[model samples]
Target: MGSTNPPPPETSNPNKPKRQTNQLQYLLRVVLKTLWKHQFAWPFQQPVDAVKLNLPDYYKIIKTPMDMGTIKKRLENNYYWNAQECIQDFNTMFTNCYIYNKPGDDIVLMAEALEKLFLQKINELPT
Candidate 1:
């Protein structure tokens, strides 16, 4: 049999801060903070509100049943779910509504803008 060289040892930099072990938790914490800052209100009313107002109508566009009752039930039990589970359900709703695809770019941009606006508002506050 031919001889094979041993694998190289892993190299790590201790100087760099460790990456978060629970990324979903970190992400949810950030999202919740933003949401709280805005009092759970959307930054832009028309665009975001329109989507929410027309959520039931989205079933026609996506060719599926829109079961908001089920979503509400899960949300009612949000205290029982972890951040990861909540985010998973959030993404799943976007996926099912076809909002997870290309057409959702505007929504993504709006979210980014909202975050920036909130940060600016925070900065403007008196220390």
Candidate 2:
């Protein structure tokens, strides 16, 4: 008799192009949120559609040029020794600057960086 059990799902698709496994999917949210927060002065979860539409004051907020002086001042003033905070700040700036200038291109690069950062920190967090 033939086996009745269903075969396991295929890991890769042939007919349709397979999506590459991103090393950064989980951290993408965090990185995206950080960028939005800093650039737009909006909450992380603010709808992307809203942002894309330039809803309300999106231009006044995110579209305006970033203040390099302010960023430098904040970095100098609100310094922290804890590596995680420092790393988070770095990621925030990395994402914000990239997003502000290049938009889509920056997002792709930032996603990869965020994933690597998260992977490095995974073992450092307390269970």
Candidate 3:
């Protein structure tokens, strides 16, 4: 066989901290904490009830169809963003969640996740 090409080596710059380099990651953590403090109540409405149910069933209950028309109207009147865009963005996010059975998969966990997600999307503004 003819001469083969050489492989490329990876570069490692260990000078800066990974977390510092990633502002979004830091901001997300802050956002998550803020969210946990405020909006985490919506999803985990009743923790005791949530714990008694299976993951799939819990999700089904919480997946109550949103009144998009109401949401759209609110967005149109309040937010500067286009109503359709807001609706699309929110719908896309709310519909694409994973149902993982992690240790904290209770009502509290659900609330925290939702709160953090919303906080991040809304530029980490305090609720």
Candidate 4:
């Protein structure tokens, strides 16, 4: 009894290429796009240049640096499995900003403002 393929769900109509209509995928993508256009999104648009800036401390503080651009790439490549991971990466990006930049200053303030909008938009999605 060597079976290579298992039976599919009874709900399936067999080969359905239209299954790419994942609503959550597009939802996350749309919010990600919106995030890029945000005013605070400026600094985090591009990944922090650790090598170019010779900022070894940034590497020390940020074990895994994250940015909207990076997250956008992940979305395009289907690198994330769910919305949870996508949100976590955004959390990390903002957390890093607070950790490295002046917490009371404009950059950090921008992070908080952007972060508020981020969570606001997430909840705005259909729960």
Candidate 5:
């Protein structure tokens, strides 16, 4: 006679697809709170040190339209940077743009929106 052991539980199901969580929304809130100190305003200014944020790798997947060169041109042409304009620019970029010729998922889209929101927030701390 031999001892019998019970079979282990099934970890996953092959027919069912894993559900993806919309973590970007929550993460965006965290990032905003941390960066903006809970103050939000429209037509915000872009920070010079924005590149130093602890953003995910995907945040850098798309290049910003308002780079140093573009900023220089805007200033030279007597145009100043505006939050709405930048938001629209990024909106168009992410909506029309794709990485590796493929569109992004919900999380990517949300992240892009959050990034835009952060850009719209005042870069400086409140007094």
Candidate 6:
């Protein structure tokens, strides 16, 4: 008679993916919340309106305008596989603020604050 309980399927394991995926996504959430809570986060939350802001030159200088909401969308869409990619997107937002805005501009200062804040937060909490 054939063995009633065949050897357990050796391949197709179901438990492994859960562990690593959870870790990366959870860490990303922590970093994202930190950024969102910062005071400077408001201006960077949404895409800048080049037309309303009357900065026609903006689109020329800044090819891509990165913002907090955009990052959130990327996260929701599973565009990033890890935390570092998200950090890079945040850095893009801040850097664009600095490049487009002149020295002594308030947004420039905001950018500086967030850039330093994110970098410091990222280094110590690395996984």
Top candidate (lDDT): 4
CA lDDT of every candidate: 0.38, 0.37, 0.37, 0.69, 0.35, 0.67
- Residue 95's lDDT within candidate 3 is 48
Q: Residue 52 deviation, candidate 2, in Å?
A: 28
What is the alpha-carbon lDDT for the whole of candidate 3? 0.37
When 1 and 5 are scored with TM-score, the better candidate is 1
Show the lowest summed lDDT stretch of 10 residues, model 1.
Answer: 2-11
Candidate 4, 105: how far from true, in Å? Answer: 2.0
Per-prediction TM-score to the true structure, in the order listed: 0.31, 0.25, 0.26, 0.73, 0.24, 0.73
- What tens-digit string does per-residue lDDT give for candidate 4 at 57-114? 7766766677877777666656655677668888889988888888689879999998
Q: For candidate 3, lDDT tens digit of each residue in 70-116?
A: 33333323422232333353443344233323446564365346645
Q: Which of 2 and 5 is ahead in TM-score?
A: 2
Question: Per-residue lDDT for 59-112 in model 2, tens only?
Answer: 334432222233333233433324353345445544544554454674455545
Q: What is the C-alpha RMSD of each candidate to the true structure, in Å?
A: 17.3, 18.5, 17.0, 12.2, 21.5, 16.1
**Per-residue lDDT of model 6, residues 1-127, tens digit only:** 3212222212223443323344346445866667889998888777776665666677678865688877766665556556666677787788888889888898888888877877776765534
- For model 5, the stretches where C-alpha displacement exceeds 4 angstroms are 1-78, 104-127
Lowest lDDT sum, 10 consecutive residues, model 6, at 2-11
Roughly what TM-score does model 3 have, to 2 decimal places?
A: 0.26
Residue-pair clashes, model 2: 0
TM-score of 1: 0.31
Q: Which of the two, 1 or 3, has more TM-score?
A: 1
